[PDB]
Amino acid sequence: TGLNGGSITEINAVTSIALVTYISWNLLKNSNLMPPGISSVQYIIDFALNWVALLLSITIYASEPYLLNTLILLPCLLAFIYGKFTSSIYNKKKMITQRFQLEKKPYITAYRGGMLILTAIAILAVDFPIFPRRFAKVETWGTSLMDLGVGSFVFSNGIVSSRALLKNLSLKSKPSFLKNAFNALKSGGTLLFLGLLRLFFVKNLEYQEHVTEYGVHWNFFITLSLLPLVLTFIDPVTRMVPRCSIAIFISCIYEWLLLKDDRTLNFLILADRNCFFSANREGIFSFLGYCSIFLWGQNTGFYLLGNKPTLNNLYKPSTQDVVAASKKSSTWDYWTSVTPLSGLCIWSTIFLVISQLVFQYHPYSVSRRFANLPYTLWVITYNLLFLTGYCLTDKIFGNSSKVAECLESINSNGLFLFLLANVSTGLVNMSMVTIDSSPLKSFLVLLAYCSFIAVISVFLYRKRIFIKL
Numbered sequence: 444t445g446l447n448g449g450s451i452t453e454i455n456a457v458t459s460i461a462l463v464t465y466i467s468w469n470l471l472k473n474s475n476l477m478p479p480g481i482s483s484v485q486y487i488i489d490f491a492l493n494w495v496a497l498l499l500s501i502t503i504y505a506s507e508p509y510l511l512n513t514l515i516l517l518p519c520l521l522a523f524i525y526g527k528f529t530s531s532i533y534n535k536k537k538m539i540t541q542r543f544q545l546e547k548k549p550y551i552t553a554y555r556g557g558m559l560i561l562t563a564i565a566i567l568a569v570d571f572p573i574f575p576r577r578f579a580k581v582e583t584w585g586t587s588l589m590d591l592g593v594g595s596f597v598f599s600n601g602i603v604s605s606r607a608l609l610k611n612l613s614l615k616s617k618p619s620f621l622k623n624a625f626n627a628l629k630s631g632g633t634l635l636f637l638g639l640l641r642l643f644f645v646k647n648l649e650y651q652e653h654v655t656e657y658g659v660h661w662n663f664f665i666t667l668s669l670l671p672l673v674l675t676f677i678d679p680v681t682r683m684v685p686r687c688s689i690a691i692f693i694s695c696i697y698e699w700l701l702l703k704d705d706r707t708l709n710f711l712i713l714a715d716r717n718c719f720f721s722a723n724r725e726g727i728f729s730f731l732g733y734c735s736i737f738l739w740g741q742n743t744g745f746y747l748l749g750n751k752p753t754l755n756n757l758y759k760p761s762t763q764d765v766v767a768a769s770k771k772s773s774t775w776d777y778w779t780s781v782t783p784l785s786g787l788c789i790w791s792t793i794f795l796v797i798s799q800l801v802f803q804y805h806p807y808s809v810s811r812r813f814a815n816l817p818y819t820l821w822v823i824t825y826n827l828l829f830l831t832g833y834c835l836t837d838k839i840f841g842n843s844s845k846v847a848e849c850l851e852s853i854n855s856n857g858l859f860l861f862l863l864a865n866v867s868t869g870l871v872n873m874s875m876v877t878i879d880s881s882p883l884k885s886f887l888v889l890l891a892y893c894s895f896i897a898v899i900s901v902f903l904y905r906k907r908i909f910i911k912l
């Protein structure tokens with residue numbers, strides 16, 4: 444680390460392989476040349492498309508992603524054409540009779556699985572000399588590949604956590620104010636406990652400082668735990684204003700406070716670590732950006748988790764039908780009641796136009812350490828623009844009415860496999876010296892580790908075992 448990072452135009456090219464391989468898998472599956480029953484060929488193809496391709500893209504072919512993105516796509520298209528040439532239900536009454544329910548979407552499963560796979564690879568890949576130094580994290584100002592996961596995980600959690608509000612809306616009795624706090628504590632208990640355990644153990648660890656990231660005591664597992672508890676209190680205010688109008692206000696207030704004078708920056712950068720507040724400045728101050736990211740994720744998760752469009756679902760959680768509203772509908776309810784793709788396109792366009800003008804006037808640059816406005820804009824725009832393609836692929840190929848096994852397996856056992864991967868890298872880091880390894884040895888070690896994780900994950904999934912911590 445310690446070097447200025449790369450650019451966005453390289454990060455996009457490096458990370459597009461996750462969507463390219465998904466499209467290739469869909470094409471190959473629809474080519475109909477594969478045998479119907481499960482076999483070794485299916486597992487080999489799945490493992491080569493999911494795990495190995497990302498490993499090659501991150502490490503060896505990092506200097507030529509455009510050449511890698513075609514050798515996977517073209518043969519599958521040729522096979523699809525060959526199969527198509529060689530080869531010899533939706534009802535409106537159902538939609539009328541259907542009520543409002545939650546549904547499990549496949550592209551969300553793929554989007555969650557790919558991020559976990561990439562995180563699991565890149566956690567260990569950073570300790571070897573074959574991993575380019577441009578992708579390592581940067582201190583204060585700068586952009587890199589490893590500064591995006593921290594925002595992406597918060598965005599994904601915000602997207603998912605809206606189904607609780609959608610479900611509780613159908614309830615005929617309002618839960619008490621003290622009951623939601625208990626629910627939030629129950630949801631965040633394991634993360635809070637694992638975060639607190641590190642404070643009691645750092646003294647025994649006596650590892651490197653790394654204080655400048657979050658502080659002496661603060662941690663990411665506390666930031667993830669405290670968000671729902673704080674956002675519980677916000678609902679009475681949202682009774683009067685839309686949810687996004689709170690994120691906008693918070694972002695504007697924080698940016699005005701940062702750009703008003705240089706005193707705040709001087710305190711944040713040069714102040715001595717004397718008292719508790721001075722020893723955890725960054726962890727406390729990045730909360731005002733993480734809250735905005737979480738709120739925007741929650742707002743985005745309103746029109747994706749349903750099974751049919753409802754009334755005013757672009758900005759409000761609602762279950763009212765639009766069939767009765769279709770009689771002499773106004774010009775507002777016609778535009779603010781959309782299918783998932785229509786909402787995603789509108790929000791992507793608005794955020795692109797806002798960011799393209801914000802980036803031309805901000806004197807400073809992106810900074811994860813403080814989580815200022817440009818970082819949030821970049822994090823949100825990237826995720827919206829990837830979800831748009833992920834959703835469009837399903838509509839083009841027509842499967843909205845399962846996905847590769849290695850994606851579902853890693854999606855169904857997230858936290859446990861994350862901890863297992865962390866322990867594995869911790870073991871390899873002490874079983875050998877990494878910085879003095881030859882490239883072939885490094886590649887073999889990475890391949891063996893990937894195979895071990897994949898085998899364990901699939902074995903847990905087949906036998907129907909789900910571990911909740």
Ligand SMILES: CCCCCCCCCCCCCCCC(=O)SCCNC(=O)CCNC(=O)[C@H](O)C(C)(C)COP(=O)(O)OP(=O)(O)OC[C@H]1O[C@@H](n2cnc3c(N)ncnc32)[C@H](O)[C@@H]1OP(=O)(O)O
Pocket residue numbers: 458461546547548549551552554557558561562565566588589590591592593595596600603606663667829854855856857858861
């Ligand atoms: C493509 C890549 C793009 C981004 C590309 C950018 C770069 C990407 C990083 C790369 C650069 C290296 C890496 C940097 C970053 C670090 O180096 S480190 C980052 C730090 N990471 C962490 O701390 C891990 C955080 N983990 C968590 O927040 C969570 O525990 C997990 C593991 C993500 C998910 O946990 P969980 O929510 O308990 O999971 P789970 O119970 O399975 O699901 C929860 C809910 O979702 C529901 N659900 C699940 N699937 C679905 C579905 N398909 N539909 C609907 N609902 C669903 C479940 O039914 C459940 O519903 P409820 O029961 O809540 O009602």
